Amino acid sequence: DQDGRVNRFYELEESLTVLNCLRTMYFILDGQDVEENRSEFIESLLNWINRSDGEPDEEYIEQVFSVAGKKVFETQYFWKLLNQLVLRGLLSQAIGCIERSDLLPYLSDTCAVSFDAVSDSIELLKQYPKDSSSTFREWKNLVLKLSQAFGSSATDISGELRDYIEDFLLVIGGNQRKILQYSRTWYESFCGFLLYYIPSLELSAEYLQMSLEANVVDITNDWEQPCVDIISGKIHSILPVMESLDSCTAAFTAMICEAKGLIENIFEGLEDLFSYRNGMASYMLNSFAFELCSLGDKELWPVAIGLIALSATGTRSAKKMVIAELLPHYP
Amino acid sequence: LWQTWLPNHVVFLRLREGLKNLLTRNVVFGLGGELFLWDGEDSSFLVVRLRGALSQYQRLLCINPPLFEIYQVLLSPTQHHVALIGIKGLMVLELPKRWGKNSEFEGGKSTVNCSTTPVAERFFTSSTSLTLKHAAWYPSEILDPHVVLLTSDNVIRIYSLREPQTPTNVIILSGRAYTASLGETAVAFDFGPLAAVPKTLFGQNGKDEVVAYPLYILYENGETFLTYISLLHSPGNIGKLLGPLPMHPAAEDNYGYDACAVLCLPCVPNILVIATESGMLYHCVVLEGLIPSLYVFECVELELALFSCPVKLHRDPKCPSRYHCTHEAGVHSVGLTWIHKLHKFLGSDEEDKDSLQELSTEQKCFVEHILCTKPLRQPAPIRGFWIVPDILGPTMICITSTYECLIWP
Amino acid sequence: MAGIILTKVGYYTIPSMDDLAKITNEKGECIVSDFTIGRKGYGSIYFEGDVNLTNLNLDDIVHIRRKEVVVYLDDNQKPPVGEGLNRKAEVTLDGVWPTDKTSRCLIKSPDRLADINYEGRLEAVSRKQGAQFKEYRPETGSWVFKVSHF
């Protein structure tokens, strides 16, 4: 909102995406599986995914709801954009795009059979479980039943719309092959896998792999690779880069990573703090403090001194000395 | 398209006018392009052809009708028999043969007689207070049809239609008394998908692999048990019952009590849905151990997605990751979008639990209230639920308490 | 003894069987108020008011088990309501605790039992069987409830 340069906005959002992913993977279940707390997890995941990138941007919704050379909405585009919405948990929008063209039209008229499918499917979508891993167990049941029933039945529709409805039901049922097929980016795949196939992080290792086989990591943005790293276990070695994006964020990030116990002081030995002797987090925080001292903003000086004072490591006398040297510069 | 004209078919007027004249009810099943509706007042099926007129239907009569009320109807795996399931008995109906260009039963006669056979008739008359809690077919599509009955004595018995009065297998799971362990009794069960298991699992030898089906058993107090069933190799009296399966992670409320329904989604590792009367749905990953355990990946509260009613769970014929829930407020669809992320190698050690936990924090199932039956005065449960499987889009049929035929989408 | 039979190990009466003998009158009738029959470590049954224990085979009538109790095994040999031991009574069952579904251990901690409101669960378990919950004591898992008859 208040800006000359928006580059800072972009970088800060990227930092946010990567942090959302980190929370979703290590800051909700505490090493357990999704059953431990289905509600919170799916909430964060669904959040992480729909803040990473903008698409499907409504500037693209109308993009196809406008393009013709075909009868109404029934080309690879409408469906790709319907499945995309489903894979990202965007069920509301998904439903909307259906009640947009041929829910009742072409179907309620042409084929009464597939109309019931396309309809109570939208019903199941209307009630995708987000709190009970039991309700989901039963949900996938009704979905697989629907997909089998439709699977072998009255084909009173076009050759293409037939499959176009089957695929939609497969994706909703969790068919791996399909979830990969209609995915534009690896994180769409990964998200889908967790939402419709099996909601277990014990398979994330495999999910990510399949996802990356379908769509490679897009080096356009700086958040994707870090997210891949998070998901795949190697959290570390991100502090220096984040320190390059913004010293502050990096500092507190290292701090909470120490709080979680994801990084610790391996050192085991020289009467002072600003070193490798203490944590990597202690180091980054103290560094930030010192950096704040030259900023000349008296509002942050309390933050600087407080940061140093609360530093979980270092003798009271060492801190005494540091404050003894910094304070005289207070503006 | 039948999705348009089916709600106006006369069979629903007939059934509706039969009203004016506990197990959860499901009076409908589908087969081919036909819909079968149980008419309780006449003890017969009304058959409507969906594929290939509003007044046309066939009546399939029971040569020997059941005298107990039929709550549920259940087509067999081979699709030649229908289980007529009540609280006070179970009867199996043999479907007649089809012929004629329209593949109507017995050439399109208005009325067709069907042979029936009662099952376990002794147990329901000898012990007057003995009731049926749950029933299903043995899943095989190759062997002779076998029905599986869970009765109020906390015993599961399996019957071949060739000897419908003598169990082939009994599973003792272990009212005159006042008791505090009132919930230590089975309320439901469900078979998992086909599995190959070592023949040594049943006490025989050869290091050879045989067909078996996992049988998951749900107690009222929420405890779950597991045993593998092989009609050929299982002993007459099955005692290798595993459980109660430990439920992880530890929950402050101990996952409550009052469990009423269970569903095994057809995936590997198996995933159980456990429903409670309060509207809680638990999605449990079955982790291999010799006793396996459950990891509650997530929980869904239907009371929030809109509550003290029985909940009924339905599999989806298309996707193993979706199931449906029916109750006094209507129908919910649940999509477990995370099923496909779990690989077949998963185990029950600590690092696997931590991975499942981490995954559950970034994954959530999709729950949607697709049909609302809430009244204006006392709510009534539905009488029928069926998903017509068409590859071009599943069509759902829901028969209300007043025999209104709702179709979705 | 003048009529009453009780020999199963662990069982007892208040007043004791010996005391009941001396209470028997000239014509051989044993009438006592506020009689209790129990089984050490499993529970007891308190019958408020006067009851006629004369020639009652308590071994065949009363059965106290873990989390369970039976009075008169079959309905045919049961007297009408208000007579014999088929009457108002207060039942106490000991060692009544829920099981942790994760560890499979019994939950005996009062704070943990308050967390899951086991007391409310026992109120429901009582009503569903036609009884009125009275109280629950965690330290011993004692579930006390009143019954109108057996």
Side-chain angles (χ1 to χ4, degrees):
Chain A
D1 289 325
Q2 174 67 66
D3 63 297
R5 195 221 287 188
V6 179
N7 209 296
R8 180 67 173 169
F9 175 72
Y10 175 59
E11 315 186 322
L12 286 172
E13 291 203 307
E14 287 196 289
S15 268
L16 177 57
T17 294
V18 172
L19 267 187
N20 285 319
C21 181
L22 178 72
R23 164 152 176 289
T24 308
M25 307 293 297
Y26 298 83
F27 298 73
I28 292 178
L29 308 176
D30 310 327
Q32 315 298 51
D33 214 305
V34 178
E35 256 205 48
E36 183 82 42
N37 186 357
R38 193 193 173 69
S39 54
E40 263 301 311
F41 182 78
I42 305 187
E43 183 189 72
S44 186
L45 166 57
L46 282 169
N47 166 68
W48 164 51
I49 297 295
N50 298 315
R51 296 192 79 186
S52 55
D53 65 324
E55 303 186 9
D57 52 298
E58 43 184 296
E59 183 168 52
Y60 180 50
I61 293 184
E62 268 55 55
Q63 263 290 62
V64 186
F65 268 76
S66 183
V67 193
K70 296 291 180 179
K71 305 184 172 184
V72 258
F73 297 72
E74 284 148 50
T75 286
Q76 323 168 72
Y77 288 58
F78 169 89
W79 292 101
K80 287 181 180 177
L81 313 192
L82 186 62
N83 295 144
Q84 185 169 7
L85 290 173
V86 182
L87 293 181
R88 287 156 160 284
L90 304 174
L91 303 180
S92 306
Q93 278 149 285
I95 286 183
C97 302
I98 305 175
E99 294 179 306
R100 257 302 184 198
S101 41
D102 326 350
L103 161 53
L104 308 172
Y106 203 110
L107 289 176
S108 185
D109 283 329
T110 315
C111 182
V113 202
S114 65
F115 165 75
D116 288 298
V118 179
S119 57
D120 42 49
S121 93
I122 295 181
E123 187 51 46
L124 283 175
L125 286 172
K126 285 186 183 175
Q127 58 205 65
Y128 177 94
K130 287 176 185 172
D131 302 74
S132 190
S133 296
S134 309
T135 313
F136 173 78
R137 192 186 173 186
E138 308 174 309
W139 185 87
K140 202 194 173 196
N141 214 315
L142 322 184
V143 184
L144 285 177
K145 185 170 186 172
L146 196 169
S147 59
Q148 193 207 230
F150 183 98
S152 49
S153 198
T155 310
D156 292 305
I157 28 182
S158 295
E160 275 176 45
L161 201 76
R162 171 64 186 184
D163 322 315
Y164 283 19
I165 299 181
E166 285 201 69
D167 288 38
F168 176 74
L169 294 174
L170 292 186
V171 166
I172 298 185
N175 180 214
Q176 298 192 24
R177 192 72 179 177
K178 253 52 189 177
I179 291 189
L180 276 184
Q181 188 171 66
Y182 292 135
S183 282
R184 170 178 155 274
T185 66
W186 66 272
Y187 47 93
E188 298 191 312
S189 316
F190 188 84
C191 183
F193 286 134
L194 285 172
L195 290 172
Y196 310 99
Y197 189 72
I198 300 177
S200 171
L201 283 178
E202 170 66 48
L203 287 168
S204 55
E206 272 293 311
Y207 289 159
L208 187 64
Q209 188 218 89
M210 318 193 111
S211 311
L212 293 164
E213 283 190 298
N215 322 82
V216 192
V217 202
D218 180 356
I219 324 171
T220 270
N221 51 72
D222 313 286
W223 67 267
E224 272 179 46
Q225 185 55 55
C227 281
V228 163
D229 293 323
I230 291 175
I231 297 176
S232 70
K234 48 177 188 156
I235 296 180
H236 73 320
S237 50
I238 62 166
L239 303 177
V241 189
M242 271 189 96
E243 175 145 61
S244 300
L245 302 196
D246 173 68
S247 50
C248 188
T249 311
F252 293 100
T253 286
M255 181 280 298
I256 208 160
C257 278
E258 201 163 75
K260 249 297 180 182
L262 295 170
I263 59 177
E264 69 149 61
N265 186 42
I266 297 170
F267 188 64
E268 167 188 62
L270 285 149
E271 284 176 25
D272 238 0
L273 84 174
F274 182 72
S275 70
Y276 77 83
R277 297 190 100 223
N278 303 306
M280 171 60 196
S282 193
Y283 184 79
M284 300 194 67
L285 284 174
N286 281 134
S287 295
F288 188 56
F290 289 7
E291 177 185 348
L292 281 173
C293 292
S294 288
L295 205 59
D297 172 8
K298 75 186 183 194
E299 297 294 306
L300 308 183
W301 263 83
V303 166
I305 310 293
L307 226 28
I308 293 184
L310 299 177
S311 182
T313 46
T315 334
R316 167 158 253 275
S317 64
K319 297 185 183 182
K320 187 189 180 190
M321 295 169 65
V322 176
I323 301 185
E325 287 192 295
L326 298 179
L327 206 62
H329 295 279
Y330 177 74
Chain B
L1 294 175
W2 64 266
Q3 291 86 346
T4 303
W5 57 255
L6 180 62
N8 301 124
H9 200 277
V10 64
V11 295
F12 300 110
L13 284 169
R14 185 94 180 193
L15 297 166
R16 194 174 303 146
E17 294 171 4
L19 287 178
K20 307 188 185 72
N21 290 30
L22 290 173
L23 281 172
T24 51
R25 277 189 179 103
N26 194 353
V27 304
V28 54
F29 78 88
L31 174 51
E34 278 172 340
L35 189 68
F36 296 68
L37 298 125
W38 178 251
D39 183 350
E41 299 303 331
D42 188 63
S43 297
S44 54
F45 278 107
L46 304 180
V47 184
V48 178
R49 177 160 299 285
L50 299 178
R51 296 191 178 94
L54 298 181
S55 74
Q56 294 303 129
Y57 67 85
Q58 283 190 295
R59 183 177 295 277
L60 302 188
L61 292 181
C62 295
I63 292 167
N64 298 120
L67 302 165
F68 54 89
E69 184 169 10
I70 301 306
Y71 283 76
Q72 305 168 356
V73 298
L74 195 56
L75 185 65
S76 70
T78 50
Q79 305 188 320
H80 300 115
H81 299 81
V82 185
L84 310 179
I85 303 166
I87 292 167
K88 294 299 191 180
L90 191 150
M91 170 173 290
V92 174
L93 175 146
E94 184 197 29
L95 292 173
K97 301 181 184 191
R98 303 175 190 82
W99 69 77
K101 264 204 289 174
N102 301 331
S103 292
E104 293 169 309
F105 290 111
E106 297 192 359
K109 303 193 292 206
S110 72
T111 311
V112 181
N113 300 322
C114 305
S115 299
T116 62
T117 62
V119 175
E121 205 180 9
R122 54 178 295 205
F123 285 104
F124 295 108
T125 58
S126 299
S127 184
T128 56
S129 66
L130 199 76
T131 61
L132 184 57
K133 305 287 281 293
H134 192 88
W137 293 94
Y138 186 74
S140 177
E141 297 173 15
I142 296 170
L143 304 191
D144 288 331
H146 285 65
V147 288
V148 185
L149 283 69
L150 168 65
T151 47
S152 55
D153 56 356
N154 202 26
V155 177
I156 293 169
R157 296 181 180 82
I158 303 176
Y159 299 86
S160 180
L161 300 189
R162 208 165 292 277
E163 291 183 0
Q165 306 306 325
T166 301
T168 62
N169 304 87
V170 179
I171 313 175
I172 295 94
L173 312 174
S174 307
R176 184 69 181 85
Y178 290 100
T179 179
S181 287
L182 206 50
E184 282 195 338
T185 196
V187 296
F189 65 79
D190 200 23
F191 282 102
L194 173 92
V197 303
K199 199 169 176 175
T200 67
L201 181 59
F202 305 105
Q204 292 157 342
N205 229 332
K207 182 169 198 195
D208 289 303
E209 57 183 8
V210 300
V211 172
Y213 301 85
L215 176 61
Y216 294 96
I217 299 164
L218 178 65
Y219 271 16
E220 182 199 315
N221 64 10
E223 294 178 346
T224 304
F225 300 81
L226 167 64
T227 184
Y228 283 82
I229 304 299
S230 159
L231 284 184
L232 177 56
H233 309 282
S234 284
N237 303 313
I238 299 171
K240 58 165 223 63
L241 200 68
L242 305 174
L245 309 185
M247 277 183 88
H248 300 271
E252 188 180 9
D253 66 354
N254 202 32
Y255 301 102
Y257 343 78
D258 292 2
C260 62
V262 66
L263 197 72
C264 183
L265 304 181
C267 50
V268 177
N270 300 156
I271 285 169
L272 299 188
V273 183
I274 296 173
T276 75
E277 289 159 13
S278 55
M280 293 300 305
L281 296 168
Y282 298 110
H283 301 160
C284 310
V285 187
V286 180
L287 297 176
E288 304 297 347
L290 180 47
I291 292 180
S293 61
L294 301 178
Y295 191 88
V296 179
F297 194 90
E298 70 186 341
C299 67
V300 167
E301 323 205 26
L302 295 188
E303 182 175 321
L304 280 49
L306 288 164
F307 198 119
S308 170
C309 70
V311 166
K312 185 185 200 98
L313 302 172
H314 309 264
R315 289 215 269 285
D316 188 300
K318 304 287 178 32
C319 192
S321 63
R322 182 183 287 92
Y323 70 94
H324 308 266
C325 180
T326 59
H327 38 78
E328 63 186 348
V331 186
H332 275 84
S333 290
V334 184
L336 284 55
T337 57
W338 50 266
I339 300 287
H340 310 288
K341 297 191 172 61
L342 302 189
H343 55 59
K344 311 159 74 173
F345 288 2
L346 270 164
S348 176
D349 57 67
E350 184 61 14
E351 64 158 28
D352 290 355
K353 285 182 181 62
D354 291 356
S355 293
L356 289 171
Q357 196 281 314
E358 178 168 359
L359 179 62
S360 60
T361 61
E362 64 186 8
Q363 295 285 319
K364 181 188 170 185
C365 63
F366 182 65
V367 176
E368 194 161 23
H369 190 192
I370 51 162
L371 296 175
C372 197
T373 59
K374 266 299 191 210
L376 49 78
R377 173 206 169 180
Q378 209 176 330
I382 72 179
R383 294 180 183 275
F385 180 89
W386 186 258
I387 297 160
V388 174
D390 188 328
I391 59 174
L392 296 165
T395 312
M396 187 179 301
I397 299 166
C398 176
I399 312 307
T400 70
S401 62
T402 58
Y403 287 102
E404 181 175 14
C405 182
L406 305 180
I407 297 183
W408 182 98
Chain C
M1 178 60 199
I4 309 180
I5 303 307
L6 185 67
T7 67
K8 297 184 299 194
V9 180
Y11 279 71
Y12 65 87
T13 53
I14 314 183
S16 70
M17 283 291 292
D18 290 326
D19 291 8
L20 289 172
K22 305 171 200 194
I23 282 167
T24 316
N25 66 9
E26 320 176 326
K27 82 193 191 181
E29 234 153 65
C30 191
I31 295 94
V32 295
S33 180
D34 300 356
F35 162 79
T36 297
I37 180 172
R39 185 195 165 195
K40 182 50 60 68
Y42 289 92
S44 58
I45 311 179
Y46 175 66
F47 297 94
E48 194 176 325
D50 291 315
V51 310
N52 190 4
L53 304 177
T54 305
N55 286 88
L56 282 186
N57 187 318
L58 301 174
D59 287 328
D60 299 357
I61 293 173
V62 179
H63 302 269
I64 298 170
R65 302 163 178 181
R66 183 65 67 191
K67 300 174 169 236
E68 187 180 24
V69 54
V70 189
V71 181
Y72 297 109
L73 288 168
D74 61 351
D75 190 307
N76 288 121
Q77 298 295 106
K78 190 196 318 203
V81 173
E83 305 180 7
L85 299 185
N86 182 29
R87 41 140 298 162
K88 292 181 74 170
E90 189 179 341
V91 178
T92 298
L93 289 173
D94 302 310
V96 182
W97 294 289
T99 298
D100 187 309
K101 289 177 186 173
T102 304
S103 61
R104 300 305 311 165
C105 296
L106 293 171
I107 292 172
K108 303 184 183 182
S109 174
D111 188 0
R112 185 94 185 88
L113 290 165
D115 278 359
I116 69 186
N117 189 36
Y118 190 58
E119 188 161 317
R121 165 61 175 182
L122 288 181
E123 290 184 38
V125 172
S126 297
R127 290 173 191 269
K128 285 172 175 171
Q129 296 177 83
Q132 166 169 290
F133 172 93
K134 188 186 158 75
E135 68 177 36
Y136 176 72
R137 302 192 294 271
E139 180 276 344
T140 169
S142 290
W143 171 36
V144 183
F145 59 93
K146 288 206 186 304
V147 303
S148 58
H149 60 262
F150 296 91

